[PDB]
Symmetry: C7
Subunit: 30 residues, 7 copies
């Protein structure tokens, strides 16, 4: 369904946020 | 539908957050 | 509709978050 | 409606997050 | 209603995130 | 209800985010 | 249900965000 799929798109965008925060962690490590 | 499209706007806004966190990572790296 | 408009308000608020993160990045640059 | 008003409460809480991240930016600049 | 009440719980949890970011701001000031 | 319970799981996960941001604040404090 | 399951996917992605913030804290601790 379109609403469920749009909620999956939200979930995928929150995973992108997580990956961006991992880039911040890598920056402070290096 | 209107609700599904509004949820997709939420997803797009979260991608903007993800990009801004990549900007923070780049700023820490110099 | 009122639910779709409220979800658009959420999307606008998450763009405010993104912009605040960009301000953090510009603070770390300088 | 109750669901729309609750979604508005979520939007207002996301604006509070934005304002807090602005505080972080000011703290890094000070 | 239960859906509206659960959306209010999400808003309460977002305010906790805002508080935690004020803690990070305070930690950088010191 | 299953939708309300899933929204409560989102709220709990946002609390987890808040706790993790306090860990960042503690790290800056040390 | 599909919508409940998509909301659970959002909750899972927010826990990934929390983990990445723990990684940021760990990188600031050395």
């Amino acid at each position: 369904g379109e609403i469920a799929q749009a909620x999956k798109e939200i979930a995928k965008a929150x995973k992108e946020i997580a990956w961006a925060x991992k880039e911040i962690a890598q920056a402070x490590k290096g």
